[PDB]
Amino acid sequence: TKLFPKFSQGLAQDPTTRRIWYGLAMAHDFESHDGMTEENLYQKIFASHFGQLSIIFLWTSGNLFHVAWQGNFEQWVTDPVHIRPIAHAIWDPHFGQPAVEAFTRGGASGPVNISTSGVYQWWYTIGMRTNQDLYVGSVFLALVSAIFLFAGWLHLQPNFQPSLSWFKDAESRLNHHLSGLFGVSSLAWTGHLVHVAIPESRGQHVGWDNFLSVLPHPQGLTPFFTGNWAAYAQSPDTASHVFGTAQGSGQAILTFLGGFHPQTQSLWLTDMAHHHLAIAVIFIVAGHMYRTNFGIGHRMQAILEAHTPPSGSLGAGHKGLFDTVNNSLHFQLGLALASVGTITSLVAQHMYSLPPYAFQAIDFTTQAALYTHHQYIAGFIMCGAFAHGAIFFIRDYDPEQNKGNVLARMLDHKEALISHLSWVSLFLGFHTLGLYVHNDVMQAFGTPEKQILIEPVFAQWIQAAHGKALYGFDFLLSSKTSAAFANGQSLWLPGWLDAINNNQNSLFLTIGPGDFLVHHAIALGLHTTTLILVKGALDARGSKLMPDKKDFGYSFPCDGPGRGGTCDISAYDAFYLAVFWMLNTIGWVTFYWHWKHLTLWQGNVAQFDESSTYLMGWLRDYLWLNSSQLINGYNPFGMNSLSVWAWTFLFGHLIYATGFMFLISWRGYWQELIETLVWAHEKTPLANLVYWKDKPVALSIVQARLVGLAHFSVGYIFTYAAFLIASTSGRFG
Amino acid sequence: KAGNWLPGSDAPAWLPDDLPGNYGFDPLSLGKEPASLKRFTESEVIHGRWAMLGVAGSLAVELLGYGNWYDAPLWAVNGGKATWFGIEVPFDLNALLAFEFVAMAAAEGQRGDAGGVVYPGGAFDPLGFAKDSSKSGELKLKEIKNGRLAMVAFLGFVAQHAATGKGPIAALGEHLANPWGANFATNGISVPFF
Amino acid sequence: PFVPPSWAPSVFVPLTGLVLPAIAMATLFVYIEKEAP
Amino acid sequence: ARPTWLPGLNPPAHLKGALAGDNGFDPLGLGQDEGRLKWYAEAEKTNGRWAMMAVAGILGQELLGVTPAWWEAGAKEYDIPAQALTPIEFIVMGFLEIKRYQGFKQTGTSGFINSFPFDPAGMNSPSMATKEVKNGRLAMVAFIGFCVQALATRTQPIEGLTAHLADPFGKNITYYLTHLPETLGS
Amino acid sequence: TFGFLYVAGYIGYVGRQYLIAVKGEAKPTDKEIIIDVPLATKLAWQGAGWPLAAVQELQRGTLLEKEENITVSPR
Amino acid sequence: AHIVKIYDTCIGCTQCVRACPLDVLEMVPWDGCKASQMASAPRTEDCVGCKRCETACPTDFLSVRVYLGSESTRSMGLSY
Amino acid sequence: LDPQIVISGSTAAFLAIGRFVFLGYQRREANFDSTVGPKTTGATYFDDLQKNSTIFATNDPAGFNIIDVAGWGALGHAVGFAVLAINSLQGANLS
């Protein structure tokens, strides 16, 4: 039999091409490998994590190297407002001379790509000023990548493999990760800001060669050890400070100004220094909570066992959950993806409205790409969070050990949960779509005053509570007599209120009826996607149509045409259907973010306010209007620098449409077609001398759903990425 | 049973009859679990005893002309010095928190380890009013009824001040001046549509 | 010291785009087809 | 009942007292695998042996009037160029250390080049083994004291001691940690 | 808001009354494809007081089925 | 090879055996049902996984179950 | 404020209440961790890293070992600097 795959004898004995495809697709499902034990499972995962870490630091090293080698960082730092950053050089032998000239720009030697990832603003903010600064960082991270790779090898060796119990010491790992991984890293990052980043923003060079002889503050550590910590907040950078120079600069290293630096339109460095110092203290303290070898602290099992409501409303409460969580990796992975997935959305939300990197706001293409980038990644992570929660129920859930606790009771009323999610999705869809169609008919008939425009009073009321005085609610921070206004009036409100009432920045943009409709469409996306994913998990173990679904696994094709038909009945298929709704939801979010910002960046916000209340406005004034430059990247008269995005735009449409083939036409058609191809090859003279070793067959039922979904997603992403960058960059960049 | 909160109703089974101050009032059945009721029984007495001290203290300050209960801690803000009965006190806010935190931790920690004692007696009853242990039923009923009354009164102090801004004694004087024109129905706050 | 030569793309782009893929595909094709002893 | 680092503390089981300087000090229980404790014991001496020479070298250089301070020696230029020094050191140290490791694996003791143990003068006994560790530990603590005192006081070891002796209460860690601008502004 | 809910509850309550009415018949399925118009008109007019009738069913406990009389999948 | 299991709720209707298009199943004597016969799966190496047997089983839930497993020339239904 | 008085004063209070007030309560809650049981039952190096290999015995009558001193001393230092830092914010110009 064939060697590959070495981890499954069932695959290795398959004489068809399914062996190749399935061998690739089951490589990282360690639990399903032949001869796998629990202890070997954890040691492989530990080794794999070292590999991922080494790739991350190597990928970062490659970015640093190419910007220094081929970028214009040293030129960009001089005039960041009027210089486009360079990502890397182009050496494409297929280029013609017009293409070579078209992509030559920014004073570069030859063709180059413009960066959109914002690394220039990030690196410039944290104190990098020269190409040699980037070169040393690149070599340092390449070395760090090597060390992690060695550690991955080291801990696979006979005397360094941790035992199974080592991976299940929950109290000790939480203490270290909270205090050391989070707390000390944040404390160390405060050291960089106080010692390097802040001085570099004030025109003083601090490097490894002189940082031991430079005083971060004129009073060196006397305020710190004497408790007079307020001395570090005196004489902050003035409003006239020019970033990177000593004119208008101050001396404070810890402040709470609370606003935006007037020139860079980004958060103050002294606030970001005090921010990281504050959480570092909290995280170091929080890391002394759990039991270890020293006789103090909590044991997490005791905490869970205690929290049972005395009235029996939650049944057994949280009894038995410690083993349920501590023994299942899919439960832990589901909690990790759900938490990280939400934080990825939070990063996108807060970075566009509280830009932390100098000159990030004015780079419109970078801001658009960064928000879209992280929202699409958050969407994928959330779908994975529910997928592994569904896998937990099939593989790791033990009904006997979870008898009567909160987890078991979720399955008890799963129909109630699914029924109510179904109602909310239907309600939002009916009325959200209905109002849009009503407004479209009114616009078509020429009566824009007959449409249903509902003021977002609840959201506009929140903005009033934060100090936005436009709506006249005179509430909390919007009223100058409230205690909330008075108490903070000496710490951060003067800066915060100044920024929130500036209508040229993205801090709490003004909202109207156009924002009301879009937000309710977003809710429909979240609820429907949750409905599909939640049903896939709660029904994973069985249903009326298939009472014993657990016996078949997480992913199987179907149960056949009997009992009416069971296509797409597994929990794997519920995730597969939910990915479509995730893309649809994130699409609505990113269209909404992009259109509301393009109108702001052009100064004509009225277009969004007027055209966003009906769906023809989106198609006409957003998709059609902003495609004009994209599709002219190359035309019968020539081409320009946008021809790559024009080409990638159609490239996306093609991959997307190809995915329809794997989703619409199913296996039986193709297997019978391949059988005539097998006949044709064998009877053809001069070709039947050559022969195959793996019998050709059609893709499997499950494989084609993944292959179709992969093409659908890739085409989805590449089409909008090309349009997002091209429309934003051509308009302003 | 000390009475019936809702005449004609049926007393809850889970409320023992001899429990002091038992009027059968438990619309939400919060005391259904015996263990929970035991904790609630202690908390009511402790809450009432603190409320009785607080209401007595709040009224005493304003009756003697030393301000209202709400203005008392303003010296620690503006920069003035503390005063008690007009006698100047030599401590400042940060110092006061030190004595209170240590003092209250000792007393409350000592009470906490007693495991739910609510009628200690002994050194806490020097005059021997409850030494009998048989006639204490009325005294326990009197304590809880005055305790519940004090708890309602203090909520009145907080609620009334948040609406009109005047002290409890000043509010009483204003009600008597114009009972029909000065009450909760005339705040402009309590009833939005009046 | 770090700056690579100006001719680096001329060698590395064909090397990583045409040469290494050819050897990688040949290595993988032989590996998957290889039969167990 | 040997003396222990903490009064009235029975030493942990994994520490038997056989090793030299065994005071039962292992609050984190790092040494509990017999295969690692033997490696750590050898690692303790070698770190101490390098510390003992380093402390003597810093003190000797200062007492003999060598300049600049021990933390500026690298900046100074010598007969051999700095580029040539490292290749010489790498080859020489690589040879000595590789043979240092090879002997340890075979014998389990410490030695030099091809001799394990390296005791030409025949001085060796449990007392000598104990004295080596205690003097070694003191040097390891001493060297870190030099490094930190250079950071804060920016004075050489003997120089710092003289200042403390001259003005014990006026000059100490309390003074220097609150006068970094003055000392570093000179 | 309260205008729509009255009509929406009217329609839903009338349909629920008809569905319960035919469950007692010999062949309920044939009473659903082929509507019993005389009964439907009778229930159509009585639905004007649905909010009163709906509340009284809730308080008497006949609005909801028992958990033990509803089929559910294995768990 | 796929896995085919017969459970003790079989009533011996023989419909699974008739439905099977590869003669994988057969009927054997039994005493656990009125028909005094039970379905058997002696030749699962020829099973292709069509699940026609499950379509034909009257009992609820099924008394014959097919669990698709390792693939081969026979189970993949190849004539080449 | 004088740091020596505030920091030492707060530490003394937190050590005093810890030794004399909450020592009994703290020990009882520590036994609630005994009901669950030990973390691991093994004899490998990595299993040994999860056991109380060293027991910190103390001659104090109440059993106020060094680990307890570090715990209650840390809270006193944390509270002491909070008091000093907040009081420092008074009379601060442009801060």
Ligand code: CLA
């Ligand atoms: C045993 C070695 C030793 C000795 C004899 C001295 C002696 C002196 N030191 Mg130095 N020092 C040492 C170690 C030592 N130091 C260490 C390890 C550090 C790093 C923390 C420092 C950091 C240091 C500074 C920052 C300063 C001095 C200063 C001084 C002088 C005044 C005393 C003082 O302020 O001490 C108080 C402060 C100390 C840190 C001394 C601690 C000494 C004890 C014995 C260390 C015990 C370590 C312990 C065994 C480790 C256990 C680890 C645990 C995890 C198990 C004086 C000449 C001052 C001076 O005037 O210098 C010119 C001064 O400014 N020392």
Ligand code: CLA
């Ligand atoms: C850190 C997070 C994490 C980790 C450790 C894992 C780990 C695992 N997952 Mg999970 N998963 C994650 C995130 C994670 N997942 C996310 C984010 C999602 C949502 C998308 C999912 C959704 C998911 C599903 C639905 C399933 C798993 C499964 C698995 C297991 C097998 C994986 C395997 O064999 O892949 C093999 C890998 C492949 C076949 C290829 C993966 C690459 C895809 C097809 C996209 C390729 C795009 C391509 C590069 C684009 C080219 C563009 C072109 C222009 C060049 C394994 C335990 C499977 C399992 O067995 O669970 C029990 C399973 O069914 N995961």
Ligand code: CLA
């Ligand atoms: C534009 C495409 C589209 C639309 C409109 C819908 C609509 C719907 N999907 Mg579907 N879905 C789509 C694409 C779409 N999907 C795709 C591509 C996939 C991937 C396979 C899925 C996968 C999917 C899943 C897995 C689920 C849904 C669900 C839903 C419902 C969500 C709740 C809702 O909006 O209720 C409001 C209803 C609508 C907006 C539907 C349209 C109503 C029209 C306008 C009524 C017109 C009536 C009028 C009198 C005219 C009739 C004329 C005729 C008689 C000739 C809804 C029925 C969820 C569901 O069923 O929840 C209950 C669900 O679980 N969808």
Ligand code: CLA
């Ligand atoms: C990074 C990948 C890559 C690279 C470096 C190239 C490079 C090239 N492609 Mg492209 N190509 C690629 C990927 C790539 N392609 C892919 C993926 C596709 C499919 C989508 C194509 C499809 C494609 C087509 C259809 C054509 C090209 C052509 C070309 C040539 C255009 C420039 C020219 O005028 O050459 C002129 C070429 C020469 C003067 C000769 C160059 C050297 C020859 C090709 C090989 C010499 C071998 C040597 C004698 C012996 C072995 C040496 C070896 C062991 C070191 C050039 C050789 C054009 C061409 O001319 O191809 C031959 C062409 O028609 N490519």
Ligand SMILES: CC1=C(/C=C/C(C)=C/C=C/C(C)=C/C=C/C=C(C)/C=C/C=C(C)/C=C/C2=C(C)CCCC2(C)C)C(C)(C)CCC1
């Ligand atoms: C199925 C399953 C699973 C999964 C799950 C998931 C995936 C979930 C998710 C979830 C989620 C994803 C959630 C979230 C949530 C959230 C929240 C809950 C939030 C909250 C918030 C808050 C509360 C806030 C507040 C505030 C505000 C608003 C403002 C100001 C500030 C403050 C803070 C105050 C698992 C694994 C378990 C397993 C089993 C099964």
Ligand SMILES: CC1=C(/C=C/C(C)=C/C=C/C(C)=C/C=C/C=C(C)/C=C/C=C(C)/C=C/C2=C(C)CCCC2(C)C)C(C)(C)CCC1
């Ligand atoms: C013997 C004896 C005695 C005495 C005793 C004593 C005197 C003691 C002391 C003790 C002490 C005196 C202790 C201490 C401790 C301390 C500690 C443990 C600390 C800690 C700290 C920390 C942890 C910190 C932290 C931080 C930082 C670093 C920065 C900022 C922030 C914070 C603050 C957080 C008596 C007579 C009583 C009795 C008899 C016997």
Ligand SMILES: CCCCCCCCCCCCO[C@H]1O[C@H](CO)[C@@H](O[C@H]2O[C@H](CO)[C@@H](O)[C@H](O)[C@H]2O)[C@H](O)[C@H]1O
């Ligand atoms: C402005 C006013 C602010 C007031 C803030 C009050 C903060 C209170 C913090 C209490 C911290 C815990 O301290 C408190 O824990 C337990 C009660 O819960 C008591 O300890 C007791 O409590 C258990 C439950 O009642 C008993 O079964 C046990 O005998 C014992 O564990 C402690 O003796 C007490 O000190």
